[PDB]
Amino acid sequence: VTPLDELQWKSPEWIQVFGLRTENVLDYFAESPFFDKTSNNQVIKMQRQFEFAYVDPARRQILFKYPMYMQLEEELMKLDGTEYVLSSVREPDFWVIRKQRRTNPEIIPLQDYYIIGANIYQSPTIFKIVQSRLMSTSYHLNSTLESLYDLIEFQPSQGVHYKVPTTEMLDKLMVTSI
Amino acid sequence: LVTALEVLSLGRPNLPTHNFKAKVPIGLILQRLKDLNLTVSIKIALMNIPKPLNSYHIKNGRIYFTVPNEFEIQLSTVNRQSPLF
Amino acid sequence: LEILNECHDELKALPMLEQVEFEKNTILQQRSKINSTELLDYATKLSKFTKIPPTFD
Amino acid sequence: DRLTQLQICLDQMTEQFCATLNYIDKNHGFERLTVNEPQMSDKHATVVPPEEFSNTIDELSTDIILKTRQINKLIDSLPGVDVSAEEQLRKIDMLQKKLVEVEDEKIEAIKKKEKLLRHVDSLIEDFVDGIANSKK
Amino acid sequence: VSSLYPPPPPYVKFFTQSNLEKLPKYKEKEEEITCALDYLIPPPMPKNQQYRAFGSIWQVKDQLPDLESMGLTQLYKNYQYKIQELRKLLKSLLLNYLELIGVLSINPDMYERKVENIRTILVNIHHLLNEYRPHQSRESLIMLLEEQLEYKRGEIREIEQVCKQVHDKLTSIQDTLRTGS
Amino acid sequence: TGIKLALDPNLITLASLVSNPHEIYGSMPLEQLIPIILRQRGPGFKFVDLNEKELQNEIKQ
Amino acid sequence: NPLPTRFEVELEFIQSLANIQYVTYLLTQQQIWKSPNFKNYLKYLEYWCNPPYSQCIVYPNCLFILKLLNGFMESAIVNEDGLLEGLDELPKIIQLQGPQWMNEMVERWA
Numbered sequence: 001v002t003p004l005d006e007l008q009w010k011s012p013e014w015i016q017v018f019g020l021r022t023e024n025v026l027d028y029f030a031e032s033p034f035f036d037k038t039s040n041n042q043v044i045k046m047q048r049q050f051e052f053a054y055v056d057p058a059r060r061q062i063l064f065k066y067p068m069y070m071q072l073e074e075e076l077m078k079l080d081g082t083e084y085v086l087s088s089v090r091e092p093d094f095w096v097i098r099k100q101r102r103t104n105p106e107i108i109p110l111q112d113y114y115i116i117g118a119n120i121y122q123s124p125t126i127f128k129i130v131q132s133r134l135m136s137t138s139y140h141l142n143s144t145l146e147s148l149y150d151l152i153e154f155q156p157s158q159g160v161h162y163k164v165p166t167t168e169m170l171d172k173l174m175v176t177s178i
Numbered sequence: 179l180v181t182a183l184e185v186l187s188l189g190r191p192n193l194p195t196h197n198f199k200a201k202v203p204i205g206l207i208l209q210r211l212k213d214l215n216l217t218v219s220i221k222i223a224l225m226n227i228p229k230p231l232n233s234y235h236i237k238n239g240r241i242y243f244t245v246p247n248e249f250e251i252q253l254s255t256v257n258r259q260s261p262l263f
Numbered sequence: 264l265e266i267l268n269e270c271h272d273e274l275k276a277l278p279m280l281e282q283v284e285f286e287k288n289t290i291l292q293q294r295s296k297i298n299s300t301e302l303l304d305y306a307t308k309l310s311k312f313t314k315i316p317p318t319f320d
Numbered sequence: 321d322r323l324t325q326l327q328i329c330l331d332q333m334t335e336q337f338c339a340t341l342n343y344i345d346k347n348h349g350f351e352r353l354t355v356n357e358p359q360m361s362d363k364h365a366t367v368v369p370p371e372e373f374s375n376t377i378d379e380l381s382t383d384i385i386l387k388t389r390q391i392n393k394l395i396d397s398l399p400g401v402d403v404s405a406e407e408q409l410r411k412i413d414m415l416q417k418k419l420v421e422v423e424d425e426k427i428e429a430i431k432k433k434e435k436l437l438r439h440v441d442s443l444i445e446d447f448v449d450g451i452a453n454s455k456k
Numbered sequence: 457v458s459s460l461y462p463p464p465p466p467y468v469k470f471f472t473q474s475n476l477e478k479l480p481k482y483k484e485k486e487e488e489i490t491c492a493l494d495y496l497i498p499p500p501m502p503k504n505q506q507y508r509a510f511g512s513i514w515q516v517k518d519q520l521p522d523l524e525s526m527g528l529t530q531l532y533k534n535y536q537y538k539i540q541e542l543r544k545l546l547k548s549l550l551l552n553y554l555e556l557i558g559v560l561s562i563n564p565d566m567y568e569r570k571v572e573n574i575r576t577i578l579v580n581i582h583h584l585l586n587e588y589r590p591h592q593s594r595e596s597l598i599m600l601l602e603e604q605l606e607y608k609r610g611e612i613r614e615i616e617q618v619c620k621q622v623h624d625k626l627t628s629i630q631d632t633l634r635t636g637s
Numbered sequence: 638t639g640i641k642l643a644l645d646p647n648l649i650t651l652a653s654l655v656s657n658p659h660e661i662y663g664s665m666p667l668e669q670l671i672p673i674i675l676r677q678r679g680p681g682f683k684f685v686d687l688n689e690k691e692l693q694n695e696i697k698q
Numbered sequence: 699n700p701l702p703t704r705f706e707v708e709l710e711f712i713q714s715l716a717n718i719q720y721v722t723y724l725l726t727q728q729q730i731w732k733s734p735n736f737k738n739y740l741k742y743l744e745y746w747c748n749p750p751y752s753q754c755i756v757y758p759n760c761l762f763i764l765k766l767l768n769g770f771m772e773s774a775i776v777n778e779d780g781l782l783e784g785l786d787e788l789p790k791i792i793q794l795q796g797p798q799w800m801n802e803m804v805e806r807w808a
């Protein structure tokens with residue numbers, strides 16, 4: 001089984017049909033396995049089918065630039081619980097969408113997801129990143145150690161050392177002739 | 179037409195190849211050794227020669243300056259205007 | 264001596280006999296592999312693919 | 321490449337139609353049907369002087385006519401208009417036969433060149449060994 | 457939630473060392489598959505001469521489709537007739553643009569038929585160019601052969617002028633040897 | 638069907654793909670050609686070990 | 699709705715070799731380069747080199763990649779365990795020179 005924090009996801013059928021821009025990152029992300037079906041975003045999507053505090057200036061810029069996300073925030077303030085909100089955008093192609101729990105507003109964040117060229121990645125934990133790198137380092141170091149110890153021969157007459165695999169007068173000629 | 183000719187000639191379009199998918203002609207080696215004999219012989223004509231060094235053997239891409247029962251030193255030049263090596 | 268040296272190497276800077284015979288053999292080997300109508304059909308197949316359409320920006 | 325330039329010229333010339341319609345729709349003004357009726361305008365409309373408006377209309381029309389001239393000349397200079405495919409193939413086979421013939425001409429030209437090569441080889445080697453024996 | 461790319465074809469499971477070693481004795485003796493070694497033989501060309509790839513229809517020998525076959529109007533159809541028809545189509549396009557400007561200048565509510573006429577004039581122009589495209593391709597092949605011939609004859613000329621320079625420089629050393637004799 | 642075509646595939650571009658062993662080696666000067674000669678003749682091969690007799694009875698093979 | 703044909707499936711697979719993100723995906727799976735089945739399949743797919751099969755090749759850089767990948771197959775050795783030796787450094791080559799190869803063929807496009 002491949003865990004969710006370790007895969008890159010894209011839907012190029014969705015890219016060919018709809019095309020990804022800033023206005024459809026959230027329902028593009030809704031087709032990803034990263035998206036939770038029990039989320040407030042999806043349930044208010046079903047409902048619609050049927051100045052302010054509590055946000056950083058990075059999200060203020062996104063809200064004041066894009067009106068549909070102010071509509072989304074105004075509809076999400078009525079509910080409490082899990083949601084996905086779009087935090088940082090670089091036009092034309094970079095996004096960050098964060099899992100977020102909201103209580104009435106007191107907001108704590110959760111795992112994030114960054115979008116680079118319609119290719120969605122889940123933000124891994126920095127422990128997991130450095131831990132995988134140190135697993136690779138430890139494995140390669142252990143292989144180096146074992147292959148080096150295979151080259152070690154011990155003798156009592158000397159110290160421990162490496163296993164052995166199985167004309168002086170020309171300068172005087174030079175200095176005498178020249 | 180360029181891609182059509184590449185594919186219908188080699189079975190492949192012409193792209194840079196870094197791995198296996200040259201060869202120096204031995205007749206060209208023989209010809210270059212003959213003209214290298216001609217090059218050392220066309221070079222030594224313009225230079226004066228020492229009297230004990232008049233024995234020179236002219237074969238095999240180079241010149242054999244020999245002094246009998248003493249030594250035999252072999253030298254090559256690359257072109258007309260470069261000194262011997 | 265030096266003017267015939269110059270004459271010799273400016274004549275020698277020309278392609279060689281085995282080289283031009285290998286070129287002739289390659290040209291005659293293209294005869295069996297290359298067909299004109301198959302060439303034109305394959306090239307007009309590849310016309311819309313192997314290059315940028317020179318109409319867009 | 322010539323048909324490529326023709327297709328480019330048609331696309332650009334239809335885009336010239338589009339751009340001319342764009343300018344004449346967006347950058348027009350207001351005029352008097354009668355002198356009695358009031359005249360007014362806003363900040364949201366690009367009011368332009370009528371004389372340079374007519375000048376830009378005239379230069380847009382000259383650009384359209386000039387592009388039509390290049391398209392017409394390019395159609396006139398399209399490569400190959402009177403020969404049919406039978407004459408094309410009758411050119412193709414004589415061109416390959418002349419290519420083989422001139423490659424054979426290169427074979428005997430290089431044979432003459434190699435004759436001259438070994439001739440001057442023998443000349444210069446006789447010269448150098450003779451003068452070396454004379455100088456020795 | 458599956459993989460991004462399709463796997464290799466299941467035919468890969470048939471290509472073993474035993475199958476390869478039994479293939480040449482099989483060669484000595486849309487298909488009717490009789491054994492496992494039939495997948496080791498390259499398949500024939502399509503009998504219908506149309507094959508499907510990447511969600512599209514392809515033909516082994518493609519042909520330029522017609523306006524009637526694609527559901528549009530072809531006005532008019534040894535290429536001098538097509539070149540004069542191209543000139544006539546260009547002049548008709550310019551006249552249709554002028555008429556469109558007139559219709560927009562008096563009543564922009566019958567513009568639909570004029571835009572349709574410009575649309576069909578333009579596709580007729582483009583289809584005439586596409587009909588001329590094999591002729592221009594064959595001209596390009598002729599130009600390729602002619603440029604190869606030009607390079608060949610240029611090599612002939614430069615080789616022979618080097619040779620004649622050798623002849624007249626040898627004549628020059630002969631003349632100065634006669635003078636110094 | 639049609640007619641075959643005789644072409645020089647080394648040059649297709651207007652004013653390589655077939656590896657001609659003489660066009661890539663004969664035309665260039667000798668000074669950077671000799672190392673290629675030695676490396677093609679052998680690993681660790683020196684200029685001394687050449688011989689016209691060796692080439693003459695090797696080309697007959 | 700007809701079933702797929704061997705010609706069309708093999709055409710799509712051989713042409714997918716031009717997509718060298720796809721052959722990176724293929725040659726980053728340990729069960730593919732180790733299997734001699736893929737070696738024998740890529741040797742078999744050399745019928746796309748010759749006409750009339752080569753006429754249907756829309757993306758001929760796939761044929762280029764096919765010859766490049768079959769360059770390692772005569773240096774391949776299969777053992778009694780099924781490990782195709784000499785193939786451990788091919789994924790290294792593909793992942794190292796993938797961006798370079800696709801950049802070069804994009805330059806050939808331009």
